[PDB]
Amino acid sequence: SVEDRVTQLERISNAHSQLLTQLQQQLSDNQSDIDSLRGQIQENQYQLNQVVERQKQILLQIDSLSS
Amino acid sequence: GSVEDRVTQLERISNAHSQLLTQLQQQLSDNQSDIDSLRGQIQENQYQLNQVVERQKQILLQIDSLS
Amino acid sequence: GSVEDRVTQLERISNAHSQLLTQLQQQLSDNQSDIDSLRGQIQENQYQLNQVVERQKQILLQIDSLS
Ligand code: AUC
Ligand code: NA
């Protein structure tokens, strides 16, 4: 059974090897995907900041206009 | 030391590896769904941003006449 | 070759798997952490965006009294 247990081990080892290299490729793809998503969230944030800052100016212009 | 002892160890580790690989796969899949979910969320947020930009523009000319 | 050789090999590949496994676990946790963080920020963005929308309604009202 030793020969057979060992053969079973070499087969499972092989499948492990193949899976691990798949997990590795996907993980590093996901990191990049996340980089893109962070990129967009940050730009969105900047756009939001610009919008908010312009609201303040609008609110201030309205006050000047009120006089 | 004996081959039987070493194969027994190897089997023990092999099993631990199979359970770990399953958890990895389960948790990788969760992280991929989240990537897709986050991406859907960002698209929705960009969309609302643009509309806000365009309404703020409609306000800016409403104000420009009254100046 | 010998069951001895095949077992030594299995042990060497099996150590390689354990190390790689630790590294992929890490990389996956980093991907989870980055997602959770990014979820927080996109909710904050949207919360502030909702405040900008209610603010613009008040701005139209104020604009109405000016004319
Ligand atoms: N929605 C919206 Au606005 C401004 N300023
Ligand atoms: Na986090």
Side-chain angles (χ1 to χ4, degrees), chain B residues 6 13 17 20 31 45 48, chain C residues 8 11 18 31 35 46:
Chain B
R6 298 163 73 182
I13 297 173
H17 290 173
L20 289 142
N31 188 70
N45 183 67
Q48 303 174 251
Chain C
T8 290
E11 284 163 342
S18 293
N31 295 340
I35 295 288
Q46 156 90 291

Side-chain angles (χ1 to χ4, degrees), chain A residues 35-67:
Chain A
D35 296 347
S36 166
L37 300 180
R38 182 184 306 106
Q40 288 160 48
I41 276 154
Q42 167 139 257
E43 283 160 63
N44 285 7
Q45 172 87 87
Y46 291 157
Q47 286 177 253
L48 178 77
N49 291 345
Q50 186 180 3
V51 171
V52 176
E53 225 76 296
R54 196 65 148 113
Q55 270 189 323
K56 287 174 199 339
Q57 286 170 178
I58 290 164
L59 289 168
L60 288 179
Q61 292 158 254
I62 282 153
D63 298 338
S64 303
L65 283 172
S66 301
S67 39

